[PDB]
Ligand binder design. Structure first.
Ligand SMILES: [Mg+2]
Ligand SMILES: [Mg+2]
Ligand SMILES: [Mg+2]
Ligand SMILES: [Mg+2]
Ligand SMILES: [Mg+2]
Ligand SMILES: [Mg+2]
Ligand SMILES: [Mg+2]
Ligand SMILES: [Mg+2]
Ligand SMILES: [Mg+2]
Ligand SMILES: [Mg+2]
Ligand SMILES: [Mg+2]
Lengths: 56, 65, 129
RNA sequence: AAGCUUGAGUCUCGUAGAGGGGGGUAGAAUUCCAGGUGUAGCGGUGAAAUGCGUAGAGAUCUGGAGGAAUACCGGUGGCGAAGGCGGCCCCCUGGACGAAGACUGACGCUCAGGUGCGAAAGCGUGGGGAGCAAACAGGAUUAGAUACCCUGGUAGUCCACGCCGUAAACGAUGUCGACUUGGAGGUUGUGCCCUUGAGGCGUGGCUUCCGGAGCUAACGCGUUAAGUCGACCGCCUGGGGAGUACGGCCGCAAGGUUAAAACUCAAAUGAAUUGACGGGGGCCCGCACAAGCGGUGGAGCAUGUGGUUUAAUUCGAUGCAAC
């Protein structure tokens, strides 16, 4: 998320925008996922669990 | 809401840059069918087109490189 | 495979009885038709009718007397896996007479009682109550 | 002996697909090699140390070299007999599914033996080797730590042609064929009606959840049944001994497969229920902690116990809730 600062715009606002962009990307989450190797089976199980949760 | 269905097209081409850029984010990452409201085959086609563009370096893999 | 037609028909009938169906449609045969006729004679069903030239379809109208199914239990004893043949005196009496058995009798397919009356045995198709 | 189409097939247009096999190639990222800038630490954890780094590491920019896997799309998405299969593109090719129709006329089903496919790991020669990572080493941790944790690190993971032939190969539901109130959907098509607009009519195939009848030991399954029938097989007959021995057959080997007996036990389980318990989750509460105020424990003294002792040290009280 390459972010540039506009004229007539505060630093805090820019920071907030950057944060939003990051959130949109889901980079941190991806990193977390990749931090340790996941077995395919485990991933599948997780997905299934998520699907189950979705149903309410 | 699916635009492709509304249009009534056979194939989504990698030629049209303006349509493809609407379906990816700024960083160079594809937007899901669940958010956009697209049909699945159409979504797949779109993805393929995006990939082709990336290969040809029409739309980037990553925005920082 | 479509191995036993008679058994299939019986199953369909049972299903109809369970789910309270007014009319049950099924692929038809001459022996099947005869069986249906026999059943009608016995008093289990309203009316049967076969319709179809290339693909014959037997339609069976079922009775539900006093809010309950008339054909309570309907099961084959003779089977494609194991055929049961019975002698004249060896013929069963299903539920002490109050209930019947479909028998392939050599002088026309009929009831076990009827066969006994005649003096003839054969293959005991189904047990009907 | 003679025939039929609905079963089962083949032909016309299509339909999508991580269906395979073979060949190319793309990106990021890691590693390493080389160089440039740069300086005091880097890396790691719960905290540390081993490690790496005053030789200039990490950091970081450029140039590469490679090996592997394909982020995002990606979804109880799809396809396959299953095992499985996801970057992209081509070649070869299997199958499925459908729509109108045309034709063959039972060509059907299952399958003992038999044959083929069969994740992983392993095995075999030859490659290839970036990461990861058994083993292995060091550090920790620890009462000990052959572990969990860190730093490293060989085989292996990757291909080539073979062997192996096992997995909780699991929908723990054989395979096929038939029938029985439903819904929410999703997925994949397709044909009409003025598509009068994404849409409408219905109406066929495919998969997911809830659930009626029913069923079951219940849990639950539930038009994809574990329901109502039929076929056909396969397998079970208390647990352990033991899916082991011995023998055969297969295997390069590992082992696999078939498959006991003696002896032994009165249970072995399965579901569910009340409990209790959890170093599970949620709630709340107590001077429970925190925040505080003084103690005891150290000393002497009083007292009570125990222990030893005495001729006898009456007896009882023993976590709190005996002292
Ligand atoms: Mg003919
Ligand atoms: Mg392997
Ligand atoms: Mg090898
Ligand atoms: Mg390790
Ligand atoms: Mg060690
Ligand atoms: Mg096995
Ligand atoms: Mg599996
Ligand atoms: Mg099994
Ligand atoms: Mg259910
Ligand atoms: Mg063995
Ligand atoms: Mg004291």
């Amino acid at each position: 998320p390459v972010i540039k600062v506009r004229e007539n715009e505060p630093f805090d606002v820019a920071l907030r925008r950057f944060k939003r962009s990051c959130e949109k990307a889901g980079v941190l989450a991806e990193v977390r996922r990749r931090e340790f190797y996941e077995k395919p089976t485990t991933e599948r199980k997780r997905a299934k669990a998520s699907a189950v949760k979705r149903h309410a | 809401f699916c635009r492709f269905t509304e249009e009534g097209v056979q194939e989504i081409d990698y030629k049209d840059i303006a349509t493809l850029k609407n379906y990816i984010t700024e960083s160079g990452k594809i937007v899901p069918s669940r958010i956009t409201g697209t049909r699945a085959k159409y979504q797949r086609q779109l993805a393929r087109a995006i990939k082709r563009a990336r290969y040809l370096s029409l739309l980037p893999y990553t925005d920082r490189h | 495979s479509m191995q036993d037609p008679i058994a299939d028909m019986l199953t369909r009938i049972r299903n109809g009885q369970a789910a309270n169906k007014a009319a049950v449609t099924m692929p038809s045969s001459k022996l099947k038709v005869a069986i249906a006729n026999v059943l009608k004679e016995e008093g289990f069903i309203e009316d049967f009718k076969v319709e179809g030239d290339t693909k014959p379809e037997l339609e069976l109208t079922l009775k539900y007397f006093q809010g309950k199914a008339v054909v309570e239990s309907i099961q084959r004893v003779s089977r494609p896996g194991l055929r049961i043949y019975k002698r004249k005196d060896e013929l069963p009496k299903v539920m002490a007479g109050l209930g019947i058995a479909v028998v392939s009798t050599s002088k026309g397919v009929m009831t076990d009682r009827a066969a006994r009356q005649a003096g003839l045995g054969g293959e005991i198709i189904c047990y009907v109550a």
